[PDB]
Design a protein around this ligand. Structure first.
Ligand SMILES: COc1ccc(-n2nnc3cnc(N[C@@H]4CCN(c5ccncc5)C4)nc32)cc1
Length: 281
């Protein structure tokens, strides 16, 4: 009786999403319908709800209510309506460095929050970063959020870290950070940094630009891709400075610190925010 005029917004992983208007307050909402197809789906939906119910931050999409069939506080997640998504913004071209830098700050602020709570995002990509163009606010989408402790082909390989390509079911905070670096490069250039369709070509695209500085990392690659055995992995053929040719040296330097092959050398969300390139906000 509360939510009226519902029009589908598209399809996520969990289910169909709809835009609707609330009667209590004349504001717009975004509702996710999750179908309880199998008992595996009910267990998955229940994990997701307990997480999003306790997270409250300026750069995380706000969850208002949870209702079942007929609307009572199939499952329906009522969240805040955002104007657009980052993917729709970047189809229109690259951003001014001032806007990319501001959106990166907000993305990092949102990551620093979820990571502190021992939550990570299993599906970080421009389509799941929501924008209100009026206030230039960026908010990370709730669906994909998971505690650190069918349709497989519909998962993008593009924002996957070298480690996630080698160990496909192991998600960590550092994996969110690699994806954030990739999204930042995409906001600056208006095109995907590493656009592979398969796990191996994605690894080969990364290896053309990212140095392998540890022998442990080098030995692992020689056991999967032995062609690079007499190549000095320390100096790639097409480095990030070449891949990003019109952007500032300050942006590339900050990027080189996030797009490290090893998670051990990679800045954390907290460290990236304390970086001079970000601390000015
Ligand atoms: C594809 O699957 C999905 C998956 C999740 C959503 N979710 N989840 N929480 C949300 C909060 N706000 C919005 N707002 C839309 C962003 C772009 N939408 C338009 C942009 C421009 N024109 C029409 C719609 C509004 N969408 C949300 C939407 C579609």
């Amino acid at each position: 009786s509360r939510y009226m005029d519902l029009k589908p917004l598209g399809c996520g992983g969990n289910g169909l999403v709809f835009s609707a208007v609330d009667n209590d307050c004349d504001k717009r909402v975004a509702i996710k319908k999750i179908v309880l197809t199998d008992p595996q789906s009910v267990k998955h939906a229940l994990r997701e709800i307990k997480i999003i119910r306790r997270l409250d931050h300026d750069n995380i999409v706000k969850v208002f209510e949870i209702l079942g069939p007929s609307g009572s506080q199939s499952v329906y997640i009522v969240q805040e309506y955002m104007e657009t998504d980052l993917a729709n913004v970047l189809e229109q071209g690259p951003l001014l460095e001032e806007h990319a830098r501001l959106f990166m700050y907000q993305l990092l602020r949102g990551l620093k929050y979820i990571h502190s709570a021992n939550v990570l995002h299993r599906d970080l990509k421009p389509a799941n970063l929501f924008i209100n163009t009026e206030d230039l606010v960026l908010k990370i989408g709730d669906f994909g959020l998971a505690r650190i402790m069918l349709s497989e082909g519909l998962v993008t390989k593009w924002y996957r870290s070298p480690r996630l390509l080698l160990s496909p079911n192991n998600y960590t905070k550092a994996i969110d950070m690699w994806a954030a670096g990739c999204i930042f490069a995409e906001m600056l250039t208006g095109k995907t940094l590493f656009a592979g369709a398969h796990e191996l070509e994605q690894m080969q695209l990364i290896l053309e630009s990212i140095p392998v500085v540890h022998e442990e990392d080098r030995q692992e690659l020689l056991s999967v891709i032995p062609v690079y055995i007499r190549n000095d992995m320390t100096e790639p053929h097409k480095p990030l400075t070449q891949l990003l040719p019109g952007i500032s040296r300050e942006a590339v330097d900050f990027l080189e610190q996030i797009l490290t092959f090893s998670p051990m050398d990679r800045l954390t969300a907290e460290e990236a925010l304390s970086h001079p390139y970000m601390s000015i906000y």
